[PDB]
């Protein structure tokens, strides 16, 4: 299991815990989403370089929502949004600034989503966790992806930093 396991085609399912799902989206827009329809709704929006700030109305888990996006740099920005009730609107949360079309997600046994936040450029690239349990919720990976055991996290980080 030294070889990078994948790629697998886009899919929605109750993904197993303790794996990093390393997505490699070719386009932009909504690349990841999950909800338990009760306490957590989350998605990630991929924004291309040189994107003037604007509002877009997009499909998130078959609901249309209006969000502000921007990318004033020359690299990719993966931006997370979440909310914790059906009546709330989404809030922009963490983001990954990266020269690679790569982000990764892990759901731990407590049901929490982790992914990569910050950037190599600013020296704060880190695994962050949303302490918002959603065990057994359907995860949408809207991208080709690879599967890395989370005992091999440093290998995932190396891909996030340097590409495939
Ligand atoms: C865990 C996490 O998401 N950390 C983020 C940090 O999140 C904080 C932010 O969402 C604020 C918004 O008000 O809420 C914080 O939680 C508070 C609860 O909402 C509140 O009810 C409770 O009483 O107190 C909690 C603690 O204050 C939440 O933790 O937000 C910062 C700023 O955006 C993030 O850091 C930024 O991360 C990006 C990459 O994603 C870059 O690295 C930026 O340089 C960095 O500032 C932090 O990761």
mmCIF file of N, CA, C and O in Angstrom, residues 46-124:
data_model
loop_
_atom_site.group_PDB
_atom_site.id
_atom_site.type_symbol
_atom_site.label_atom_id
_atom_site.label_comp_id
_atom_site.label_asym_id
_atom_site.label_seq_id
_atom_site.Cartn_x
_atom_site.Cartn_y
_atom_site.Cartn_z
ATOM 1 N N UNK A 46 -14.004 25.178 -4.601
ATOM 2 C CA UNK A 46 -12.697 25.457 -5.202
ATOM 3 C C UNK A 46 -12.770 26.691 -6.096
ATOM 4 O O UNK A 46 -13.611 26.754 -7.016
ATOM 5 N N UNK A 47 -11.912 27.664 -5.808
ATOM 6 C CA UNK A 47 -11.869 28.928 -6.530
ATOM 7 C C UNK A 47 -10.557 29.076 -7.291
ATOM 8 O O UNK A 47 -9.458 28.946 -6.723
ATOM 9 N N UNK A 48 -10.673 29.335 -8.587
ATOM 10 C CA UNK A 48 -9.513 29.540 -9.441
ATOM 11 C C UNK A 48 -8.738 30.805 -9.087
ATOM 12 O O UNK A 48 -9.283 31.734 -8.493
ATOM 13 N N UNK A 49 -7.455 30.847 -9.458
ATOM 14 C CA UNK A 49 -6.690 32.087 -9.296
ATOM 15 C C UNK A 49 -7.365 33.284 -9.958
ATOM 16 O O UNK A 49 -8.154 33.119 -10.891
ATOM 17 N N UNK A 50 -7.043 34.486 -9.487
ATOM 18 C CA UNK A 50 -7.449 35.715 -10.156
ATOM 19 C C UNK A 50 -8.954 35.816 -10.287
ATOM 20 O O UNK A 50 -9.480 36.109 -11.361
ATOM 21 N N UNK A 51 -9.642 35.543 -9.189
ATOM 22 C CA UNK A 51 -11.090 35.648 -9.167
ATOM 23 C C UNK A 51 -11.486 36.881 -8.388
ATOM 24 O O UNK A 51 -11.309 36.940 -7.171
ATOM 25 N N UNK A 52 -12.003 37.877 -9.107
ATOM 26 C CA UNK A 52 -12.504 39.092 -8.473
ATOM 27 C C UNK A 52 -13.664 38.732 -7.558
ATOM 28 O O UNK A 52 -14.437 37.816 -7.860
ATOM 29 N N UNK A 53 -13.775 39.414 -6.426
ATOM 30 C CA UNK A 53 -14.828 39.090 -5.475
ATOM 31 C C UNK A 53 -16.201 39.229 -6.113
ATOM 32 O O UNK A 53 -16.512 40.230 -6.759
ATOM 33 N N UNK A 54 -17.012 38.191 -5.958
ATOM 34 C CA UNK A 54 -18.336 38.190 -6.545
ATOM 35 C C UNK A 54 -19.219 37.218 -5.783
ATOM 36 O O UNK A 54 -18.738 36.426 -4.973
ATOM 37 N N UNK A 55 -20.518 37.310 -6.029
ATOM 38 C CA UNK A 55 -21.476 36.382 -5.460
ATOM 39 C C UNK A 55 -21.907 35.388 -6.514
ATOM 40 O O UNK A 55 -22.104 35.755 -7.669
ATOM 41 N N UNK A 56 -22.034 34.126 -6.119
ATOM 42 C CA UNK A 56 -22.505 33.091 -7.025
ATOM 43 C C UNK A 56 -23.597 32.292 -6.341
ATOM 44 O O UNK A 56 -23.575 32.095 -5.128
ATOM 45 N N UNK A 57 -24.567 31.854 -7.123
ATOM 46 C CA UNK A 57 -25.640 31.029 -6.597
ATOM 47 C C UNK A 57 -25.386 29.632 -7.095
ATOM 48 O O UNK A 57 -25.402 29.383 -8.302
ATOM 49 N N UNK A 58 -25.113 28.715 -6.174
ATOM 50 C CA UNK A 58 -24.678 27.390 -6.579
ATOM 51 C C UNK A 58 -25.446 26.280 -5.868
ATOM 52 O O UNK A 58 -26.087 26.485 -4.834
ATOM 53 N N UNK A 59 -25.348 25.094 -6.454
ATOM 54 C CA UNK A 59 -25.996 23.895 -5.961
ATOM 55 C C UNK A 59 -25.131 23.222 -4.905
ATOM 56 O O UNK A 59 -24.054 22.708 -5.212
ATOM 57 N N UNK A 60 -25.613 23.233 -3.663
ATOM 58 C CA UNK A 60 -24.978 22.503 -2.570
ATOM 59 C C UNK A 60 -25.968 21.482 -2.028
ATOM 60 O O UNK A 60 -26.959 21.847 -1.388
ATOM 61 N N UNK A 61 -25.714 20.207 -2.302
ATOM 62 C CA UNK A 61 -26.568 19.128 -1.785
ATOM 63 C C UNK A 61 -28.031 19.332 -2.185
ATOM 64 O O UNK A 61 -28.956 19.063 -1.411
ATOM 65 N N UNK A 62 -28.210 19.808 -3.418
ATOM 66 C CA UNK A 62 -29.511 20.002 -4.072
ATOM 67 C C UNK A 62 -30.304 21.179 -3.533
ATOM 68 O O UNK A 62 -31.474 21.336 -3.877
ATOM 69 N N UNK A 63 -29.665 22.019 -2.725
ATOM 70 C CA UNK A 63 -30.196 23.323 -2.351
ATOM 71 C C UNK A 63 -29.368 24.385 -3.070
ATOM 72 O O UNK A 63 -28.146 24.252 -3.198
ATOM 73 N N UNK A 64 -30.002 25.439 -3.555
ATOM 74 C CA UNK A 64 -29.216 26.533 -4.110
ATOM 75 C C UNK A 64 -28.919 27.551 -3.033
ATOM 76 O O UNK A 64 -29.810 27.958 -2.275
ATOM 77 N N UNK A 65 -27.658 27.958 -2.962
ATOM 78 C CA UNK A 65 -27.254 28.936 -1.971
ATOM 79 C C UNK A 65 -26.379 29.993 -2.609
ATOM 80 O O UNK A 65 -25.650 29.736 -3.573
ATOM 81 N N UNK A 66 -26.460 31.194 -2.065
ATOM 82 C CA UNK A 66 -25.674 32.292 -2.579
ATOM 83 C C UNK A 66 -24.487 32.562 -1.673
ATOM 84 O O UNK A 66 -24.654 32.817 -0.484
ATOM 85 N N UNK A 67 -23.289 32.493 -2.238
ATOM 86 C CA UNK A 67 -22.083 32.715 -1.457
ATOM 87 C C UNK A 67 -21.186 33.721 -2.141
ATOM 88 O O UNK A 67 -21.244 33.919 -3.363
ATOM 89 N N UNK A 68 -20.365 34.371 -1.328
ATOM 90 C CA UNK A 68 -19.314 35.228 -1.835
ATOM 91 C C UNK A 68 -18.046 34.405 -2.025
ATOM 92 O O UNK A 68 -17.679 33.595 -1.161
ATOM 93 N N UNK A 69 -17.423 34.579 -3.183
ATOM 94 C CA UNK A 69 -16.141 33.943 -3.481
ATOM 95 C C UNK A 69 -15.141 34.987 -3.959
ATOM 96 O O UNK A 69 -15.518 36.003 -4.538
ATOM 97 N N UNK A 70 -13.859 34.726 -3.717
ATOM 98 C CA UNK A 70 -12.786 35.553 -4.263
ATOM 99 C C UNK A 70 -11.470 34.797 -4.172
ATOM 100 O O UNK A 70 -11.307 33.920 -3.329
ATOM 101 N N UNK A 71 -10.540 35.143 -5.047
ATOM 102 C CA UNK A 71 -9.190 34.605 -4.977
ATOM 103 C C UNK A 71 -8.273 35.624 -5.601
ATOM 104 O O UNK A 71 -8.180 35.717 -6.823
ATOM 105 N N UNK A 72 -7.603 36.410 -4.762
ATOM 106 C CA UNK A 72 -6.797 37.517 -5.260
ATOM 107 C C UNK A 72 -5.366 37.095 -5.548
ATOM 108 O O UNK A 72 -4.509 37.930 -5.825
ATOM 109 N N UNK A 73 -5.102 35.797 -5.486
ATOM 110 C CA UNK A 73 -3.767 35.309 -5.751
ATOM 111 C C UNK A 73 -3.639 34.512 -7.034
ATOM 112 O O UNK A 73 -4.568 34.437 -7.840
ATOM 113 N N UNK A 74 -2.484 33.894 -7.210
ATOM 114 C CA UNK A 74 -2.152 33.174 -8.426
ATOM 115 C C UNK A 74 -2.264 31.664 -8.266
ATOM 116 O O UNK A 74 -1.914 30.919 -9.165
ATOM 117 N N UNK A 75 -2.748 31.230 -7.109
ATOM 118 C CA UNK A 75 -2.878 29.807 -6.822
ATOM 119 C C UNK A 75 -4.340 29.456 -6.544
ATOM 120 O O UNK A 75 -5.214 30.314 -6.604
ATOM 121 N N UNK A 76 -4.603 28.179 -6.269
ATOM 122 C CA UNK A 76 -5.965 27.715 -5.986
ATOM 123 C C UNK A 76 -6.345 28.042 -4.564
ATOM 124 O O UNK A 76 -5.481 28.130 -3.704
ATOM 125 N N UNK A 77 -7.638 28.202 -4.315
ATOM 126 C CA UNK A 77 -8.146 28.351 -2.957
ATOM 127 C C UNK A 77 -9.317 27.399 -2.755
ATOM 128 O O UNK A 77 -10.314 27.506 -3.461
ATOM 129 N N UNK A 78 -9.186 26.450 -1.832
ATOM 130 C CA UNK A 78 -10.289 25.571 -1.452
ATOM 131 C C UNK A 78 -10.924 26.210 -0.233
ATOM 132 O O UNK A 78 -10.257 26.332 0.785
ATOM 133 N N UNK A 79 -12.193 26.596 -0.293
ATOM 134 C CA UNK A 79 -12.804 27.333 0.814
ATOM 135 C C UNK A 79 -13.961 26.540 1.419
ATOM 136 O O UNK A 79 -14.861 26.109 0.709
ATOM 137 N N UNK A 80 -13.913 26.337 2.731
ATOM 138 C CA UNK A 80 -14.967 25.635 3.447
ATOM 139 C C UNK A 80 -16.070 26.572 3.891
ATOM 140 O O UNK A 80 -15.808 27.718 4.272
ATOM 141 N N UNK A 81 -17.298 26.064 3.851
ATOM 142 C CA UNK A 81 -18.458 26.752 4.392
ATOM 143 C C UNK A 81 -19.221 25.769 5.267
ATOM 144 O O UNK A 81 -19.333 24.587 4.910
ATOM 145 N N UNK A 82 -19.750 26.214 6.403
ATOM 146 C CA UNK A 82 -20.663 25.342 7.133
ATOM 147 C C UNK A 82 -21.732 26.114 7.889
ATOM 148 O O UNK A 82 -21.654 27.330 8.061
ATOM 149 N N UNK A 83 -22.746 25.371 8.320
ATOM 150 C CA UNK A 83 -23.758 25.880 9.232
ATOM 151 C C UNK A 83 -24.199 24.728 10.114
ATOM 152 O O UNK A 83 -23.921 23.558 9.817
ATOM 153 N N UNK A 84 -24.892 25.059 11.200
ATOM 154 C CA UNK A 84 -25.244 24.047 12.183
ATOM 155 C C UNK A 84 -26.747 23.947 12.430
ATOM 156 O O UNK A 84 -27.178 23.271 13.355
ATOM 157 N N UNK A 85 -27.543 24.614 11.610
ATOM 158 C CA UNK A 85 -28.989 24.450 11.688
ATOM 159 C C UNK A 85 -29.585 24.703 10.322
ATOM 160 O O UNK A 85 -29.000 25.410 9.498
ATOM 161 N N UNK A 86 -30.752 24.128 10.074
ATOM 162 C CA UNK A 86 -31.385 24.274 8.778
ATOM 163 C C UNK A 86 -31.767 25.724 8.454
ATOM 164 O O UNK A 86 -31.729 26.134 7.297
ATOM 165 N N UNK A 87 -32.112 26.501 9.477
ATOM 166 C CA UNK A 87 -32.572 27.874 9.268
ATOM 167 C C UNK A 87 -31.430 28.875 9.108
ATOM 168 O O UNK A 87 -31.635 29.986 8.627
ATOM 169 N N UNK A 88 -30.227 28.484 9.513
ATOM 170 C CA UNK A 88 -29.056 29.345 9.361
ATOM 171 C C UNK A 88 -28.667 29.483 7.907
ATOM 172 O O UNK A 88 -29.042 28.671 7.072
ATOM 173 N N UNK A 89 -27.884 30.510 7.614
ATOM 174 C CA UNK A 89 -27.165 30.566 6.356
ATOM 175 C C UNK A 89 -25.740 30.079 6.574
ATOM 176 O O UNK A 89 -25.238 30.064 7.699
ATOM 177 N N UNK A 90 -25.082 29.697 5.491
ATOM 178 C CA UNK A 90 -23.697 29.261 5.583
ATOM 179 C C UNK A 90 -22.751 30.372 6.021
ATOM 180 O O UNK A 90 -22.975 31.555 5.748
ATOM 181 N N UNK A 91 -21.683 29.978 6.698
ATOM 182 C CA UNK A 91 -20.582 30.877 7.026
ATOM 183 C C UNK A 91 -19.322 30.351 6.384
ATOM 184 O O UNK A 91 -19.044 29.149 6.440
ATOM 185 N N UNK A 92 -18.552 31.242 5.776
ATOM 186 C CA UNK A 92 -17.247 30.858 5.299
ATOM 187 C C UNK A 92 -16.361 30.538 6.501
ATOM 188 O O UNK A 92 -16.359 31.262 7.495
ATOM 189 N N UNK A 93 -15.628 29.436 6.428
ATOM 190 C CA UNK A 93 -14.760 29.056 7.531
ATOM 191 C C UNK A 93 -13.317 28.937 7.021
ATOM 192 O O UNK A 93 -12.768 29.893 6.464
ATOM 193 N N UNK A 94 -12.698 27.783 7.179
ATOM 194 C CA UNK A 94 -11.296 27.649 6.827
ATOM 195 C C UNK A 94 -11.075 27.516 5.338
ATOM 196 O O UNK A 94 -12.014 27.280 4.576
ATOM 197 N N UNK A 95 -9.832 27.686 4.926
ATOM 198 C CA UNK A 95 -9.470 27.557 3.519
ATOM 199 C C UNK A 95 -8.065 27.008 3.390
ATOM 200 O O UNK A 95 -7.262 27.073 4.336
ATOM 201 N N UNK A 96 -7.793 26.459 2.216
ATOM 202 C CA UNK A 96 -6.488 25.966 1.840
ATOM 203 C C UNK A 96 -6.029 26.755 0.624
ATOM 204 O O UNK A 96 -6.719 26.776 -0.394
ATOM 205 N N UNK A 97 -4.886 27.424 0.736
ATOM 206 C CA UNK A 97 -4.250 28.078 -0.404
ATOM 207 C C UNK A 97 -3.177 27.147 -0.918
ATOM 208 O O UNK A 97 -2.315 26.727 -0.146
ATOM 209 N N UNK A 98 -3.208 26.817 -2.200
ATOM 210 C CA UNK A 98 -2.332 25.770 -2.688
ATOM 211 C C UNK A 98 -2.098 25.870 -4.189
ATOM 212 O O UNK A 98 -2.981 26.267 -4.944
ATOM 213 N N UNK A 99 -0.888 25.520 -4.617
ATOM 214 C CA UNK A 99 -0.582 25.493 -6.039
ATOM 215 C C UNK A 99 -1.095 24.229 -6.710
ATOM 216 O O UNK A 99 -1.016 24.103 -7.922
ATOM 217 N N UNK A 100 -1.621 23.294 -5.925
ATOM 218 C CA UNK A 100 -2.081 22.013 -6.460
ATOM 219 C C UNK A 100 -3.577 21.871 -6.317
ATOM 220 O O UNK A 100 -4.149 22.316 -5.330
ATOM 221 N N UNK A 101 -4.209 21.213 -7.282
ATOM 222 C CA UNK A 101 -5.627 20.896 -7.183
ATOM 223 C C UNK A 101 -5.837 19.681 -6.278
ATOM 224 O O UNK A 101 -6.350 18.644 -6.721
ATOM 225 N N UNK A 102 -5.423 19.799 -5.019
ATOM 226 C CA UNK A 102 -5.506 18.695 -4.064
ATOM 227 C C UNK A 102 -5.956 19.180 -2.702
ATOM 228 O O UNK A 102 -5.412 20.137 -2.154
ATOM 229 N N UNK A 103 -6.950 18.488 -2.161
ATOM 230 C CA UNK A 103 -7.398 18.679 -0.795
ATOM 231 C C UNK A 103 -7.721 17.282 -0.291
ATOM 232 O O UNK A 103 -7.946 16.374 -1.106
ATOM 233 N N UNK A 104 -7.722 17.080 1.020
ATOM 234 C CA UNK A 104 -8.035 15.757 1.557
ATOM 235 C C UNK A 104 -8.931 15.858 2.766
ATOM 236 O O UNK A 104 -8.843 16.807 3.543
ATOM 237 N N UNK A 105 -9.776 14.842 2.919
ATOM 238 C CA UNK A 105 -10.772 14.781 3.987
ATOM 239 C C UNK A 105 -10.701 13.467 4.721
ATOM 240 O O UNK A 105 -10.579 12.408 4.102
ATOM 241 N N UNK A 106 -10.844 13.526 6.037
ATOM 242 C CA UNK A 106 -10.871 12.332 6.848
ATOM 243 C C UNK A 106 -12.028 12.432 7.828
ATOM 244 O O UNK A 106 -12.264 13.489 8.413
ATOM 245 N N UNK A 107 -12.759 11.337 8.016
ATOM 246 C CA UNK A 107 -13.770 11.322 9.070
ATOM 247 C C UNK A 107 -13.275 10.361 10.137
ATOM 248 O O UNK A 107 -12.967 9.199 9.851
ATOM 249 N N UNK A 108 -13.127 10.863 11.355
ATOM 250 C CA UNK A 108 -12.604 10.017 12.420
ATOM 251 C C UNK A 108 -13.734 9.208 13.060
ATOM 252 O O UNK A 108 -14.902 9.336 12.689
ATOM 253 N N UNK A 109 -13.381 8.351 14.016
ATOM 254 C CA UNK A 109 -14.379 7.464 14.602
ATOM 255 C C UNK A 109 -15.390 8.224 15.453
ATOM 256 O O UNK A 109 -16.468 7.704 15.739
ATOM 257 N N UNK A 110 -15.058 9.460 15.827
ATOM 258 C CA UNK A 110 -16.007 10.302 16.543
ATOM 259 C C UNK A 110 -16.986 10.972 15.587
ATOM 260 O O UNK A 110 -17.915 11.639 16.020
ATOM 261 N N UNK A 111 -16.758 10.806 14.285
ATOM 262 C CA UNK A 111 -17.627 11.372 13.272
ATOM 263 C C UNK A 111 -17.211 12.730 12.734
ATOM 264 O O UNK A 111 -17.935 13.308 11.934
ATOM 265 N N UNK A 112 -16.056 13.242 13.155
ATOM 266 C CA UNK A 112 -15.636 14.578 12.744
ATOM 267 C C UNK A 112 -14.840 14.586 11.454
ATOM 268 O O UNK A 112 -14.021 13.705 11.203
ATOM 269 N N UNK A 113 -15.101 15.613 10.646
ATOM 270 C CA UNK A 113 -14.370 15.895 9.421
ATOM 271 C C UNK A 113 -13.098 16.679 9.721
ATOM 272 O O UNK A 113 -13.147 17.710 10.396
ATOM 273 N N UNK A 114 -11.969 16.180 9.217
ATOM 274 C CA UNK A 114 -10.712 16.919 9.177
ATOM 275 C C UNK A 114 -10.306 17.157 7.732
ATOM 276 O O UNK A 114 -10.607 16.339 6.864
ATOM 277 N N UNK A 115 -9.616 18.267 7.487
ATOM 278 C CA UNK A 115 -9.064 18.547 6.166
ATOM 279 C C UNK A 115 -7.904 19.521 6.341
ATOM 280 O O UNK A 115 -7.551 19.882 7.466
ATOM 281 N N UNK A 116 -7.290 19.916 5.237
ATOM 282 C CA UNK A 116 -6.101 20.756 5.328
ATOM 283 C C UNK A 116 -6.468 22.232 5.238
ATOM 284 O O UNK A 116 -7.248 22.646 4.372
ATOM 285 N N UNK A 117 -5.918 22.997 6.180
ATOM 286 C CA UNK A 117 -6.160 24.432 6.294
ATOM 287 C C UNK A 117 -4.846 25.176 6.195
ATOM 288 O O UNK A 117 -3.792 24.633 6.530
ATOM 289 N N UNK A 118 -4.920 26.433 5.779
ATOM 290 C CA UNK A 118 -3.745 27.280 5.705
ATOM 291 C C UNK A 118 -3.001 27.103 4.401
ATOM 292 O O UNK A 118 -3.601 26.835 3.355
ATOM 293 N N UNK A 119 -1.682 27.232 4.456
ATOM 294 C CA UNK A 119 -0.899 27.170 3.241
ATOM 295 C C UNK A 119 0.578 26.975 3.528
ATOM 296 O O UNK A 119 1.109 27.467 4.541
ATOM 297 N N UNK A 120 1.263 26.269 2.636
ATOM 298 C CA UNK A 120 2.721 26.212 2.692
ATOM 299 C C UNK A 120 3.321 27.597 2.590
ATOM 300 O O UNK A 120 4.286 27.920 3.259
ATOM 301 N N UNK A 121 2.745 28.426 1.734
ATOM 302 C CA UNK A 121 3.304 29.749 1.510
ATOM 303 C C UNK A 121 3.396 30.582 2.792
ATOM 304 O O UNK A 121 4.402 31.260 3.019
ATOM 305 N N UNK A 122 2.362 30.537 3.629
ATOM 306 C CA UNK A 122 2.348 31.335 4.852
ATOM 307 C C UNK A 122 2.906 30.581 6.053
ATOM 308 O O UNK A 122 3.024 31.152 7.138
ATOM 309 N N UNK A 123 3.260 29.314 5.850
ATOM 310 C CA UNK A 123 3.897 28.520 6.888
ATOM 311 C C UNK A 123 2.950 27.979 7.938
ATOM 312 O O UNK A 123 3.386 27.600 9.024
ATOM 313 N N UNK A 124 1.658 27.916 7.613
ATOM 314 C CA UNK A 124 0.665 27.427 8.575
ATOM 315 C C UNK A 124 -0.197 26.285 8.034
ATOM 316 O O UNK A 124 -1.266 26.011 8.568
#
